[PDB]
Design a binder for these strands. Structure first.
Lengths: 98, 94, 107, 79, 98, 82, 106, 94
DNA sequence: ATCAATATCCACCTGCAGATACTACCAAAAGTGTATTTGGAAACTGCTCCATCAAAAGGCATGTTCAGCTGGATTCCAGCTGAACATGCCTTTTGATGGAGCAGTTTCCAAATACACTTTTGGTAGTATCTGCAGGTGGATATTGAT
DNA sequence: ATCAATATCCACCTGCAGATACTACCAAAAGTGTATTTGGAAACTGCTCCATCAAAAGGCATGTTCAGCTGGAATCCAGCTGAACATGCCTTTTGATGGAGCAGTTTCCAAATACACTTTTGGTAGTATCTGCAGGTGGATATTGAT
């Protein structure tokens, strides 16, 4: 009964996703999110496929970099587990918050 | 030689909103930087908006879109009204 | 011959604003409606900040709006704070604000 | 719901690329909320450029211009 | 002899300085610093007094805002005493040294 | 001969700034840390200000050169013609 | 007739840069040396990035430069990284980097 | 309608630097964005420089100061060097 | 240190998505010659204001003593979050078929630019006279901290 | 709670830097009226590409069990950092002086706009072939983790 210790596979993943560039959020689910949000500003809109892909590349790159900052705030707090306050602290300092 | 500023206009508006209130020259300087700053940011947005659409003219329409792009929800809604209103009035006078 | 500002029912100078739009090279042409609209926006914004600053000046028992009053009025207003989020008003200071955990004792 | 369509594994993969090793259970809902504010801000602007051009189709360029004025310039989709 | 406990005067001071707007760095010392740094870039420069004052208003508003972010990083670390690491964490998240 | 003026930024002046920034307790190493941070901030702003100065062929840094330098950095300053 | 690029000894289109400066409303006029100077500054920066991106392509046993290679070239270079600090390169991914405190205790 | 791009002049520069290296369409699209971006950042700063100094002309001087303002240390020194070079070589040619 | 279970790496292989390539057509673009206009460097210089010098002075920095209490170190364990499955829901490929509507082309006219004058005005320079409030004073209330 | 050492609040008030009032001048600003030019809305619509739908394929997400190990609570204590005090430096300030250098008026030609003409070109299209490398198979080897 083989079993890897907590953290080994997670670390293995960090190495794996930092080597690749493929998007990490499922496409159709993302497209739906996008269309729903836009529907709130203007009804019956169409989206060029390249438009949606632009939103996705921009969103992931944004979230990824935010996790980097968040991770630094958790580590600052002598933790290795990121929490909501780590995200809040990062957004607040970036000026995206207060 | 001439140095323009919005001082006389800031002052007029000041007496409309607060009849018995003055403004120090240092505060007026700030108000003047504010008007200039917003003017530039608004004309900048319009400028680019016009180019993105192969338009060589900046009409009240680009100005309107710039305002929606630049101001937060509620300041935009009101700014747009005042502007549309000033343009409607202006249009029916001549 | 009325001024374009009176025609629009404005205090701010439409002739000036139209003139500044041309010398700033924003586009080859500037429609006569652009400065009217833009002058209205500048006036409204000016009115909004003067309203609030004038009130801050009253709460501090003052008759004259100084820079601190403009700062107080912009900081205490979510939207003017967003619009001027990357702006520094000289001699404005900051909003009185002390993180809870820094306060003494408990309860 | 749709924002809920952004799955936990995907938020985890995202965190991994960002070098995150351990993740609190509250993070997934925090993230979704942050993602929505991001997209609303960007889309609000793209759609604004879309309406200005009298179109009914959001173009890559509309998005790229939105990103640029939000200070998130993006290379690769024209512009 | 009467003695305020540690932290009381510090708080008295915060309320005091948050209530005023006067510059906090001595005038002349700040002016020599500006002339020293500028000179190391271009010899024979002159400065309009308002140019020096402009830099002092910008520098102080920048440092105050920086200390606010620093204070939040300390509090995040469950401390009430800011340290170099806090300043560094805030400057990193701010993108001043990402 | 200007030497070591960064020390003109005294401990009390740095405490006061921290106070306005809402800071209650300061570690002993924060003072040198802050001087270093201030110097980098001034080098970047003066460098741009002086660049606007030379471009205009002047030997005098104006409040406006500074104001323009500040705006490039995203630190717009109101109150000095800028 | 010889082109303006050829004269200034460049690959980038000097005539295009000039045309672009004019139709951009940057100023009422545009001196002739300006589009030359600017065209060369653009060519250079293009060369600096393609040179590094190319190395990155080598170091990865590849001959074709892809977005990944452009990202690694930019983020691994202190100056280019700063110049493109608020820029996102599509399909670029990130630099392999793990905070040391997260690594196994050994 | 035609759609300009810097793609051809990029490829040309590529083969000089790495004669046996190709580039993907997506990478080329990225390089085009890059060239457009730097152009706008550079032209825009020259624009302001001319305005600040009440000048109606953007000369190679404004492009130079803009480059110094915009680019980091060494990138700036070399760009200035290439810039001066092409303008000199261009002048010394009928 | 030994040793089984997995992951990771690598040398080799083949198919196709996508990069390469020859031909051709063509409108827009880039170069060239000529006439006309003007931005802005030059030269001379009026004049603002920056760098200095002088001096009296008390606001404020420096340096030290002292001990309150914060941060750092250490120990401890409840329970959360990772790993590994078993399961099966729905993302994904894509082929293709209407058809929305982006984008190209033709009109043509309200609106903008150019141009010549006339009237108005905001900014400035010269004196001259008020006024909000900074900063000092004195004493009543409020806050803090020892007991 | 009591009490005393201090900070805090504010009413009362004087001095004055800075705001307010006014006549004067005037050059640039701003408006009126024409003649001339055209940007881009408007209508028609060909072709690209976006929204759908079929629909097994099965990949990737979700629910669950288990326990490793991380986060948070509690304890102790060395010494950092705040408060207060004494001493006296040096910043602040009131104020005059030379003169650097910024800025205004003007003379003026190297250089840019404005066209018209000729010539060259890079982008759109096909049509056809070429290839870097993603992705799959083996088999070796390193990493992880239990003993």
């Amino acid at each position: 009964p083989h079993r890897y210790r907590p953290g080994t596979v997670a670390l293995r993943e960090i190495r794996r996703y930092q080597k690749s560039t493929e998007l990490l959020i499922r496409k159709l689910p993302f497209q739906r999110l996008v269309r729903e949000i836009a529907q709130d500003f203007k009804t019956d809109l169409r989206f060029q496929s390249s438009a949606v892909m632009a939103l996705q590349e921009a969103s992931e790159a944004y979230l990824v970099a935010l996790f980097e900052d968040t991770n630094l705030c958790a580590i600052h707090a002598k933790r290795v587990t990121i929490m909501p306050k780590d995200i809040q602290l990062a957004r607040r300092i970036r000026g995206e918050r207060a | 030689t001439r140095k323009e500023s919005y001082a006389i206009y800031v002052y007029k508006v000041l007496k409309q909103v607060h009849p018995d209130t003055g403004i120090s020259s240092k505060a007026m300087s700030i108000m003047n930087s504010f008007v200039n700053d917003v003017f530039e940011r608004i004309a900048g947005e319009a400028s680019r908006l016009a180019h993105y659409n192969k338009r060589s003219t900046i009409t009240s329409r680009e100005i309107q879109t710039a305002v929606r792009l630049l101001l937060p929800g509620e300041l935009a809604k009101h700014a747009v009204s005042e502007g549309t209103k000033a343009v409607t009035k202006y249009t029916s006078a001549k | 011959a009325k001024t374009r500002s009176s025609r629009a029912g404005l205090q701010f100078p439409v002739g000036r604003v139209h003139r500044l739009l041309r010398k700033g090279n924003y586009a080859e042409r500037v429609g006569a409606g652009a400065p009217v609209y833009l002058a209205a926006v500048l006036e409204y914004l000016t009115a909004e900040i003067l309203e609030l600053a004038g009130n801050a000046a009253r709460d501090n028992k003052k008759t004259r709006i100084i820079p601190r009053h403009l700062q107080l009025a912009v900081r205490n207003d979510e939207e003017l704070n967003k619009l001027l989020g990357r702006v520094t008003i000289a001699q404005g200071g900051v909003l009185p604000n002390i993180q809870s955990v820094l306060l003494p004792k408990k309860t | 719901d749709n924002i809920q369509g952004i799955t936990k594994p995907a938020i985890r993969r995202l965190a991994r690329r960002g070098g995150v090793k351990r993740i609190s259970g509250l993070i997934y809902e925090e993230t979704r909320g942050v993602l929505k504010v991001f997209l609303e801000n960007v889309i609000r602007d793209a759609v604004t450029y879309t309406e200005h051009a009298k179109r009914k189709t959001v173009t890559a360029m509309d998005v790229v211009y939105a990103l640029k004025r939000q200070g998130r310039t993006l290379y690769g989709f024209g512009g």
